[PDB]
């Protein structure tokens, strides 16, 4: 009965954490519907390199935003406990809802 | 061209309401060459601004009620 939304940047860091969710949740909770991926939404933008005003010299940059999604069945004590005490994003962010 | 209710200028309002109540001078200067034309002034020499100086013009009849600054030339040299 639990829904959780995950918005992270760096793929490698996020995925290992997104793994750490479902993995350790398969322990402290029962079955964890594995991270059904949501398309890497991207804030697209464009700019130039030289200040001496030309109509040339341009590069494209992407705000690459990774989405990950988690579903859980009927929860437990341990789940709440240990999976509310720790998290090490040092970056990435996590936002959850119990619909 | 404003759906309902037209747009004008209330400084000229306060001046004109006590200007009509008498019909005093011929000096209805305006450093506000914006407001649409409003016939409720019996048409006196709007000594309006010209971007550069206070250039006048009389308001009479046919001008049903159309904007101001288009009568203050402001543009120099003709062609």
């Amino acid at each position: 009965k639990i829904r959780i939304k995950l918005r992270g940047f760096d793929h490698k860091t996020l995925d290992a954490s997104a793994q750490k969710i479902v993995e350790a949740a398969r322990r402290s909770g029962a079955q964890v519907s594995g991270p059904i991926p949501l398309p890497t939404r991207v804030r697209r933008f464009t700019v130039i390199r030289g200040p001496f005003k030309h109509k040339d010299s341009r590069e494209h940059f992407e705000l690459r935003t990774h989405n990950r999604l988690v579903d859980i069945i009927n929860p437990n004590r341990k789940t709440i406990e240990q999976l509310m005490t720790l998290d090490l994003p040092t970056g990435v962010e996590i936002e959850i809802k119990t619909v | 061209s404003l759906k309902k209710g037209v747009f004008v200028d209330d400084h000229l309002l306060e001046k004109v309401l006590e200007l009509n109540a008498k019909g005093e001078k011929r000096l209805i200067k305006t450093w506000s060459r914006r407001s649409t034309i409003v016939p409720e002034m019996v048409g006196h020499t709007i000594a309006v601004y010209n971007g550069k100086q206070h250039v006048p013009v009389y308001i009479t009849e046919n001008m049903v009620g159309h904007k101001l600054g288009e009568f203050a030339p402001t543009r120099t040299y003709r062609g």
Binding site: F9, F45, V47, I48, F61 | -
Partner: protein, 60 residues
């Protein structure tokens, strides 16, 4: 005159139609991506010099 233009639309002046953005680390409103309030060249200096999470030199 440059000091005024920045203090002008800083302390809220009248109608909404007079709210130009600003690269706060250079000082300009032109082509300032109003998501951050960073001009072209300066968004580029900050992004280039690495001080930005998830900012990627696109390879697509």
């Amino acid at each position: 005159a440059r000091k005024a233009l920045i203090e002008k639309a800083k302390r809220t002046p009248k109608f909404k139609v007079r709210a130009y953005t600003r690269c706060v680390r250079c000082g300009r409103a032109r082509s300032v991506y109003r998501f951050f309030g960073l001009c072209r060249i300066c968004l580029r200096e900050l992004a280039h010099k690495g001080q930005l999470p998830g900012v990627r030199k696109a390879s697509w």
